[PDB]
Ligand binder design. Structure first.
Ligand SMILES: *[C@@H]1O[C@H](CO[C@H]2O[C@@H](C)[C@@H](O)[C@@H](O)[C@@H]2O)[C@@H](O[C@@H]2O[C@H](CO)[C@@H](O)[C@H](O)[C@H]2NC(C)=O)[C@H](O)[C@H]1NC(C)=O
Ligand SMILES: *[C@@H]1O[C@H](CO[C@H]2O[C@@H](C)[C@@H](O)[C@@H](O)[C@@H]2O)[C@@H](O[C@@H]2O[C@H](CO)[C@@H](O)[C@H](O)[C@H]2NC(C)=O)[C@H](O)[C@H]1NC(C)=O
Ligand SMILES: *[C@H]1O[C@H](CO[C@H]2O[C@@H](C)[C@@H](O)[C@@H](O)[C@@H]2O)[C@@H](O[C@@H]2O[C@H](CO)[C@@H](O)[C@H](O)[C@H]2NC(C)=O)[C@H](O)[C@H]1NC(C)=O
Ligand SMILES: *[C@H]1O[C@H](CO[C@H]2O[C@@H](C)[C@@H](O)[C@@H](O)[C@@H]2O)[C@@H](O[C@@H]2O[C@H](CO)[C@@H](O)[C@H](O)[C@H]2NC(C)=O)[C@H](O)[C@H]1NC(C)=O
Ligand SMILES: *[C@@H]1O[C@H](CO)[C@@H](O)[C@H](O)[C@H]1NC(C)=O
Ligand SMILES: *[C@@H]1O[C@H](CO)[C@@H](O)[C@H](O)[C@H]1NC(C)=O
Ligand SMILES: *[C@@H]1O[C@H](CO)[C@@H](O)[C@H](O)[C@H]1NC(C)=O
Ligand SMILES: *[C@@H]1O[C@H](CO)[C@@H](O)[C@H](O)[C@H]1NC(C)=O
Ligand SMILES: *[C@@H]1O[C@H](CO)[C@@H](O)[C@H](O)[C@H]1NC(C)=O
Ligand SMILES: *[C@@H]1O[C@H](CO)[C@@H](O)[C@H](O)[C@H]1NC(C)=O
Ligand SMILES: *[C@@H]1O[C@H](CO)[C@@H](O)[C@H](O)[C@H]1NC(C)=O
Ligand SMILES: *[C@@H]1O[C@H](CO)[C@@H](O)[C@H](O)[C@H]1NC(C)=O
Ligand SMILES: [Cl-]
Ligand SMILES: [Cl-]
Ligand SMILES: [Cl-]
Ligand SMILES: [Cl-]
Ligand SMILES: [K+]
Ligand code: NA
Ligand code: NA
Lengths: 527, 527
């Protein structure tokens, strides 16, 4: 029986057997008042205290969200859907600690992605018990509000100020600062890690002055806030909140009255209307996301980044080889997960209209010009591959590389990786390659479980990544020092060294996607 | 009708149509007295002059040599066998010039490989008409004596001084210095290029004071004189000449008498006994090769290299990804070109005894230790691949990299490549990969001929390599400047940048085979 006294009252955890050892899991500890009734769309309010023992022995409710129903019955998409009940009452977090209880362990805090519209901390691929067992770190993860309920903004109105889900994340970081030592953790050694919108969130904690003293360092897997889907302008945010009011019968002349009417709607009516607040969207649309609220975020984040106004610390950033392919089967014409998706030039063109809907004809022709000068045979897959690369370079890889360059120019060590291993169990088809999201299970150590039929080469790859990530959290340096491994060099402007992650051989390379990123970074923003 | 006046008399060439243009070929011009009767085993004597017109309209005799009969009827091995009559009368060279005749063209002089035991300039894959047509350079190639007839040595005795075939090469370089301007060539812009023993030969011309004023720069494809098969010690050379005498009935007390008796033997009796002058050999045995003769080579070449005593100029050096695989089917047990050659550990061990016959048990165990610590699954091909890498790293790649490091430390620009494209027409099986010898046809531009069924991607690769090699010869810098190509950086000690050559994407990488070469270069020589 493991019972821990926190600042809000006692919590009871449970013992898990993991690889011949034990891990103690405390699943579903509350970290804020449930944001119901009058609290809907406000910043999270802090917890009052319980007398008695809170049983943290099962995952809590996931936050309200739309679900992906594009492939019912299919593991490749269903594994990202929420696996506990959906509820507005969803502000909880999970703690995994080594047994015996550690003395001052480094803490890894995971922030899930999902476009800021979806996601939950309870998915199988985010289970922190392997990292706790193998590296003797404490792993923490939280649920945070998503969609309009997390990110609706009428900027400057404290009834719906924006960024509520980022404030939920921040309050969970505060919870670790105040309580993690009772679990054996060191509040002075806390690394954030997250993937896609979870990575963009981590990068915004580097910018937010209220997060500055709540963590030590940061890991960004496939995402950063300069990615084109990550931050909503003030103008589109007010537009979208007003469209949402229109669609739900809540248009009013007084803005505080709009919010009060939105607070009377059942969650389902809000969720049903979210897709439509925008005149056209894409597979990557973030309808309700982070905004410049003058609170969490004090200025446009591209200005803060450019002028060095962010926490000075080490970062670990990287991307997967085929980031853009997952998105093509959610609307590009000619694509299917159930065939080889060979498309024509005309299809490629229609595909750019799907992913770049507000963009000029010239802008879309510029994309086609840059990506279709082929090397070289008339390969059938030319256009299929070009579209996946357009979408992955624009939305993920070039923005991660630009973020890492700009961050590292202010004097801190940064380490960049390119993940290029396709999981032997991947249920999506071969043409999609090394997809977005599919490094996560290697990071959390799932291939360390021999019972699961990953290959031996994947066990070794995951074991090495897990060690590099734990060394980065503990020591700021993501080396694997014992097994004659390739040394991971810092990423600097000028040389731009990165490390490739694969089952065969790790290589130091330079200037990832140089010619493509010059296009997206220096030309495309003009268009 | 094209007739050119040389210093020895007139020669008549022939016109070839190549890609909608014309090339003039002068095949089979003599450059020395035929080395017959009393001249057998002596240095080549210079030509006397003919009155009348020498018809250089067909390839000349190849020098006497044993032939590869291991796979009769098989193109993969037969393409390297000689395709003109074998004769002691074989000191001729070929000249290809652009039409119309150029004004002061750069000259590329090809030196074929063949272990110093075999080879000829007339093979299809060395046909210089494509380079002359496309890059408007003059290409020259020579036959040089091989085997005992080229390299027998009784060191210091001018009846058989050693290095005769290197002196044949040198006299052909002298011939170009004196005559190439009559063909439109520039004698001040002459680049040597060669592969395997042809590359080792080129590297020895960099060391030989009599070659210094005969060329400008050098290209070394898969070979250098520090490779373990390239130079015979004085002691094994005298041993081998004496064994040859024993086997032919020519043992005498007076050494000049041994030579005179060897001069009475028919060539065939000499060729038949060459395999046996050594108590055991390997697939890579060079029984009669370059020696330290105090003439061509004034000291041990490792000393000259180490102390900077060589021509100061630019070099282009490189190797193929699977250099060692071709040799495994000429005697390693379990290997066959007609199956996947999966071998066991015991086979791997027997295989080291085949390739390292004079080496201690400890030495052979050290090889096995270094190459069999696997990453990682129990892959069936582990031992098959390890053997190909042992043989290719020891015999070709580590010595090319060490040569390039040591050369470049004295201040000259060097450029290193790693060739990693397997020809779509390769008649050897897939497990042999990117074999030794199979970059040659890309260098000479054979895939530029669309009629030959190489792929389009191979046409473009060859076109780019041909341009880099011609730019290196003409300008000392192997760039392809017009097609947004990767820039080829100089190879320096410290960084050791090299350029990968492939059909997909060219990359700049660093420290090729670092861990393996430390083994072969700093440890193995001790054993
Ligand atoms: C690969 O599939 C796509 C997707 O559409 C299909 O899914 C298939 C596996 C099959 O069940 C099919 O019936 C289903 O419609 C094909 O594109 C579709 O092609 C149809 C029929 O020609 C068009 O009229 C559709 O609009 C188009 N759908 C979409 C979303 O674009 C595609 O041609 C096929 N590609 C192959 C076989 O290479
Ligand atoms: C691949 O072939 C080798 C080579 O030997 C063979 O060539 C084959 C394609 C076939 O025609 C065969 O009859 C011929 O002998 C095999 O190694 C040989 O195996 C034999 C029979 O067991 C041994 O007794 C031989 O000594 C050995 N030869 C040599 C040179 O080592 C090899 O086993 C086979 N490998 C496979 C199928 O994976
Ligand atoms: C935000 O403001 C308007 C909102 O118009 C919308 O009405 C909402 C309630 C919702 O249903 C939404 O889908 C609908 O679009 C946008 O006006 C649109 O602009 C288009 C032309 O692109 C016109 O056709 C309409 O006025 C309207 N669209 C449709 C499909 O009827 C406006 O575009 C937007 N502001 C932005 C994008 O900055
Ligand atoms: C060079 O000198 C002798 C030469 O011995 C050889 O006689 C030749 C005419 C020829 O047929 C050759 O194959 C034969 O080996 C070498 O002596 C050998 O050493 C071995 C032991 O390894 C003994 O068994 C024999 O004396 C002889 N070999 C055989 C197979 O009979 C000597 O090794 C060599 N010098 C070197 C390698 O430096
Ligand atoms: C907490 O845990 C134990 C179950 O072992 C139980 O005695 C106690 O009542 C629990 N509290 C609940 C279910 O509310
Ligand atoms: C944990 O280590 C920190 C430094 O990282 C130190 O300041 C703190 O007091 C430690 N607490 C322990 C060992 O209980
Ligand atoms: C609008 O209504 C709110 C809600 O009661 C009220 O408090 C506020 O003072 C009013 N504001 C304006 C600008 O009219
Ligand atoms: C290092 O190698 C050992 C055994 O050689 C292995 O069991 C372990 O998984 C490796 N450790 C890491 C951190 O990769
Ligand atoms: C050289 O060439 C021509 C063939 O066109 C001929 O007239 C001449 O006799 C030739 N010399 C020979 C064959 O020796
Ligand atoms: C060829 O160029 C060289 C320099 O490389 C020059 O010295 C020589 O005289 C030239 N001859 C010509 C153009 O005929
Ligand atoms: C050996 O014979 C040669 C050949 O005629 C002769 O010229 C030479 O002087 C003799 N040399 C010795 C060392 O006896
Ligand atoms: C450069 O590109 C052109 C056409 O775009 C092509 O035809 C030519 O083969 C290329 N040249 C080289 C030297 O690679
Ligand atoms: Cl078009
Ligand atoms: Cl670079
Ligand atoms: Cl053993
Ligand atoms: Cl390096
Ligand atoms: K050793
Ligand atoms: Na479902
Ligand atoms: Na034959």
């Amino acid at each position: 029986d493991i019972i821990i006294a926190t600042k809000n009252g006692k919590v009871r955890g449970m013992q898990l057997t993991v690889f011949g050892g034990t891990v103690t899991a405390f699943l579903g500890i509350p970290y804020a008042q449930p944001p119901l009734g009058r609290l809907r769309f406000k910043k999270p309010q802090s917890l009052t205290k319980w007398s008695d023992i809170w049983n943290a022995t099962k995952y809590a409710n996931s936050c309200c969200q739309n679900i992906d129903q594009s492939f019912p019955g299919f593991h490749g998409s269903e594994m990202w859907n929420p696996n506990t009940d959906l509820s507005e009452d969803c502000l909880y977090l999970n703690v995994w600690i080594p047994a015996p209880k550690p003395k001052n362990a480094t803490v890894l805090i995971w922030i899930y992605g999902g476009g800021f519209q979806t996601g939950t901390s309870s998915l199988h691929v985010y289970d922190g018990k392997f990292l706790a067992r193998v590296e003797r770190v404490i792993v923490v993860s939280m649920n945070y509000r998503v969609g309009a309920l997390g990110f609706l903004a009428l900027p400057g109105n404290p009834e719906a100020p924006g960024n509520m889900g980022l404030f939920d994340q921040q309050l969970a970081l505060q919870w670790v600062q105040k309580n993690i030592a009772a679990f054996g953790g060191n509040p002075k050694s806390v690394t954030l890690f997250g993937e896609s919108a979870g990575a963009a969130s981590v990068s915004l904690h580097l910018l937010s002055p209220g997060s500055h003293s709540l963590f030590t360092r940061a890991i960004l897997q496939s995402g950063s806030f300069n990615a084109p889907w990550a931050v909503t302008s003030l103008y589109e945010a007010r537009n979208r909140t007003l469209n949402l009011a229109k669609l739900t019968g809540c248009s009013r002349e007084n803005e505080t009255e709009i919010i009060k009417c939105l607070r009377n709607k059942d969650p389902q009516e809000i969720l049903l209307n979210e897709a439509f607040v925008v005149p056209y969207g894409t597979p990557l649309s973030v309808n309700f996301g982070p905004t410049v609220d003058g609170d969490f975020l004090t200025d446009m984040p591209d200005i803060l980044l450019e002028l060095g106004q962010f926490k000075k610390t080490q970062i670990l950033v990287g991307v997967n080889k085929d980031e853009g392919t997952a998105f093509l089967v959610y609307g590009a014409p000619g694509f299917s997960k159930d065939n080889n998706s060979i498309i024509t030039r005309k299809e490629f063109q229609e595909g750019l209209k799907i992913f770049f809907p507000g963009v000029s004809e010239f802008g879309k022709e510029s994309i086609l010009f840059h990506y279709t000068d082929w090397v070289d045979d008339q390969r059938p897959e030319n256009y299929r591959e070009a579209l996946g690369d357009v979408v992955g370079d624009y939305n993920f890889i070039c923005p991660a590389l630009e973020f890492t360059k700009k961050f590292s120019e202010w004097g801190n060590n940064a380490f960049f990786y390119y993940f290029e291993h396709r999981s032997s169990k991947l249920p999506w088809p071969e043409w999609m390659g090394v997809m977005h999201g599919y490094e996560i299970e290697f990071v959390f150590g799932l291939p360390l479980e021999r019972r699961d039929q990953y290959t031996k080469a994947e066990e070794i790859l995951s074991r090495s990544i897990v060690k590099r990530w734990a060394n980065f959290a503990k020591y700021g340096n993501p080396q694997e020092t014992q097994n004659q491994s390739t040394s991971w060099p810092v990423f600097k402007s000028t040389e731009q060294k990165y490390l490739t992650l694969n089952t065969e051989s790790t290589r130091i390379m330079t200037k990832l996607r140089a010619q493509q990123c010059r296009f997206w970074t220096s030309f495309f923003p003009k268009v």
